[model samples]
Target chain A: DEILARAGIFQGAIAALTQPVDFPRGHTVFAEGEPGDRLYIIISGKVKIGRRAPDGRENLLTIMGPSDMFGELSIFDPGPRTSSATTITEVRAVSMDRDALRSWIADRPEISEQLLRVLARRLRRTNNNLADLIFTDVPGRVAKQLLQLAQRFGTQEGGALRVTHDLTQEEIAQLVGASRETVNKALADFAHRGWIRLEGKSVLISDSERLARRAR
Target chain B: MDEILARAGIFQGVEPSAIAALTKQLQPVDFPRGHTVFAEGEPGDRLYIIISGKVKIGRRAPDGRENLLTIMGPSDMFGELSIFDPGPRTSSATTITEVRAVSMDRDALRSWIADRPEISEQLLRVLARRLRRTNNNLADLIFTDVPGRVAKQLLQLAQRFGTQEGGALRVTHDLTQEEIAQLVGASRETVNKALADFAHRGWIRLEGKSVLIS
Candidate 1:
């Protein structure tokens, strides 16, 4: 419902445009440089979109879970895939292909305006990330990412905000636009202060005040 | 002016008559080399479609360093982003050489696109390409060194503006050492030495204005 609202359209306007599709756990839905065809709206499970650099370095661009939309970057711009998408588990999504999307917008031009609004909203977030990427050092970037992830996917349990995203040092490196070596070292620094504890994938925040201070 | 726009890759497949009517929304404007077309942090309600020559898009840091985003040439559009949101400019644009461009008003161009699905689609493609370029740039900054960036950037420019002369690929753009430095996020001295090294390796001939890639 939140994802649909992001389109800024009447509930009825989106009727029947999106179709259900499924991917097996661990499926490679698309590879970098493949044809970008449709938009995927997650109904369940999660997917990771990323690029593997020529040097065998992997940069995970984003992780999309329930109510998140992936593939907008593909269809809106007519280009080969900028990143690869792989399912972390059995996944369900509703997709509208390139031609269908174009025709739908032409039929209901108002929907085009709504779509652009969604694009603008996304652009604002990305613009912010780019600024942070350019200006921040390794620790600052990692600190900022933790704040964002906690805010997006946090759950309150036992007087703490626990981030549910299954992130590794490599994935965090990708998000912070740094190398794994830097992110691991920064992660250790944060752990030293007892602000957060990383057990496998989940990062549990115990001291929000200090963590927030470091982020700012 | 209409004829020039008609030949542009952006307007391809649209009716010539449709393009002829573009005068209702746009006017051809010329600028000298190195002229500033727009500045970062300025409110903009206009867009420019290149008719001839080239322009560069970049952001100026608080410390006065410039990070070159992308370059545009004939048929390419710049400043259309402002038409969508009408916010302060994200980057500055400057003419890389003598430039001929069609400047379009905000309301007129906005309404024109809302009515024409093909035109709307074309504009979306351009905007998407811009986003993709920025993504690549961010990745490059995080991943690449100065020499890697210079080699990659020059090779890209060579592909876009290259010409064959004397069995060598000569890029037809007025790229000075300063511009190269700006594009690759390095200093003029660094770019100067890099070019000299390229010349010494017989990989390129550093001419007064352009570069011949061998």
Candidate 2:
């Protein structure tokens, strides 16, 4: 619900113009540097936003799920994509053309306002992530990522928040801007403290309040 | 011939009549050197476009030390994200020199943009440019080493503030050693070591408050 509110894309207005599309898990939605002519809003399942270094190593920048918007920069800038998006699960999404959306925004000032706020929120998130890389310790960052995932993907099971962030430890490391070894160390420490339990790739956050405090 | 709106890099080629109409909405404001235009965590309601002088945008660490993020001069706009997001500011903005600027309230801009739809495109382009820079800065933090980062920062500053002198790019950025360290996200001692290394390697020549790149 929070993510939907923050997404700020009015499905009521956009849905009439866009058609739903499906992709199998592991399908690439768009590659970095490809012409960005469309944007997508996830209706179901997950997508991984990624970037590649010159050496061919890929970094997982974000894992987005239902109600999340991706491939949006091209709608405003009319340039090649800065990153790539691929399906992490068999997915359904609504797609709209850049020019179509831009024309609609001109007619609907409210949508224009909402879209700008959405972009502003994204820029703010990016800024915070950069600052965290400098000022936040690895454990603090690790904890923060876990909290965010829990909010976006978690389900309550009795007293615990259970979430499969759908990221490998290495992918988590990339998302947190840390090394896999270092991220593993922090998770192990958290597990030892009974704050969370690792169930394969899933985490059962037993102490969300504790994790929240540590995140700060 | 350079008006604030034309040079602002926002309202390029906009209708002259529109610019004239918008000028009535812009409120002229000024601040003395050492004054804060805005602080981190405060709710922002207005955006300012610089007509003269410099402003420094910075982030504050939990330890209360400010890290320099960027500097703005004439024609640059700041506090704009707040007009859209209506959230606590992500950084603090301060006057590096006595500053003269025209401020626009969010309410006023919203009403103005409704009439002149092209203004929305201009604002979108500005935000897109900023998002690209922020992303690039994140990439630099992750991929570049300290001295490499320092070199990149110096080159960028040189582009903005450098002058040609004796076949070298002399950057008179008016920033202190500590401020440069903050900008590079390093300790002062470490930044000093990097500067000395650059000097010894003949990559750059350091002068008090200025650097000349060879």
Give the fraction of native contacts in model 1: 0.19
Model 2: per-residue lDDT, tens digit, A79-172?
8899999999999887889778877776676677777888887898997786677567889999999999998999999889899877888899
Where is model 2 more than 4 Å wrong at Cα? A1-6, A11-18, A158-160, A206-216, B1-5, B12-17, B133-137, B166-168, B173-204
lDDT of 2: 0.79
lDDT of 2 by residue, B14-72 (tens): 67777778777666787997688899888897788888888888786545667666778
Check candidate 1 and list the clashing pairs.
none
Best model per TM-score = 2
Query: Residues A27-110, candidate 1, lDDT per residue (tens digit)?
Result: 988888899897878777789889877677767887878777777778777778888889988998777788888787777766
What shift in Å separates residue B64 of candidate 2 from its native position after superposition?
A: 2.2
Candidate 1 per-residue lDDT, tens place, B1-214, comes to: 5666766544565667767767545667879988999998989877788989888887765356766666888877787656555678878898878998988766776567656767766656655665777777667755764355546656666777788787779875556666667665567887778778989989888777777897
User: Which regions of candidate 1 deviate over 4 angstroms?
Assistant: A7-38, A43-45, A51-59, A72-84, A87-94, A97-103, A116-164, A174-179, A186-216, B7-9, B30-35, B96-98, B121-146, B171-186
Residues forming the 10-long window of minimal summed lDDT in candidate 1 chain A: A5-14
Evaluated on chain A only, model 1 obtains a TM-score of: 0.88
Residue A22, model 1: Cα distance from true site in angstroms: 9.0
